[PDB]
Amino acid sequence: NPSLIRSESWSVASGNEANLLDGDDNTGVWYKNHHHWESLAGEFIGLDLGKEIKLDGIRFVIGKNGGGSSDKWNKFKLEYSLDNESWTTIKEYDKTGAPAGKDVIEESFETPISAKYIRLTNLEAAPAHLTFSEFAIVSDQVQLVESGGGLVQAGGSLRLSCAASRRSSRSWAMAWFRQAPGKEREFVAKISGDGRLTTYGDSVKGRFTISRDNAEYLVYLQMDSLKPEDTAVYYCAADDNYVTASWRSGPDYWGQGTQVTVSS
Ligand SMILES: CN(Cc1cnc2nc(N)nc(N)c2n1)c1ccc(C(=O)N[C@@H](CCC(=O)O)C(=O)O)cc1
Ligand SMILES: [Mg+2]
Ligand SMILES: [Mg+2]
8 A cells, every 4th residue: 555756846747646556557647847848856756655664676667558759767766765865776777768658667676675665766857748657566649748837037038848648650730829818829839840940929039949859759949038928828739730830720739738927
């Protein structure tokens, strides 16, 4: 009956966290981050075992069924604790360049490790889009989602990132739009499938830049020189026609939206 522990900065984008304890490798959770476009060193997910136990091994399934955008940390460690303050490392991992999808992390401890907490902890900046499927111990319907957002001051910068739950063989234009409170949703930027064509709304051109990385399968919106009238919820969207990707009616998929607030 362990329970889940994880970084408080994360938000659930799909699934529910009971799926990480149900004994099923094919159910999981996709996390995002409304405060930052990267998952940074120190973020973690794992188990509070509820008491001390002599651990003989672990089986943690990271990633989750299918393809899609980058979904796993590149460098991270397995570490454990008795008091939830002092951690000891068991193993470090470098999975840089791994394709999307499940990775079953199965470890056996020749001599038992006494712990009440055990977790995977990020070592290096990675996209803030992470999926996990299962956390266990041993003891004797494409969806787009945006990360990044929050409060920044005028003259400051913020970057947004959008990931997808599946990969397509087709070429999709991607676009950002935004809606300020009780104003019509408005086009912000679009980019063609191969990245070579971009266009911007009049009021952001020369301050915002759209770009994409088709290997990570991410689309970005770099927002520089921020102004109070950039305050809005920002949505990423996908359209199989670059011409209509700037129209409200064009896109076939829309993200969940992320609040951006620019104060004076
Ligand atoms: C819009 N798109 C998401 C998508 C596409 N290009 C991207 N490109 C970048 N750089 N970043 C993204 N977030 C991104 N997202 C889609 C659209 C359709 C299907 C989809 O229908 N996939 C089928 C296969 C059919 C197909 O290949 O279209 C499946 O079973 O996964 C997947 C992703
Ligand atoms: Mg599961
Ligand atoms: Mg279409």
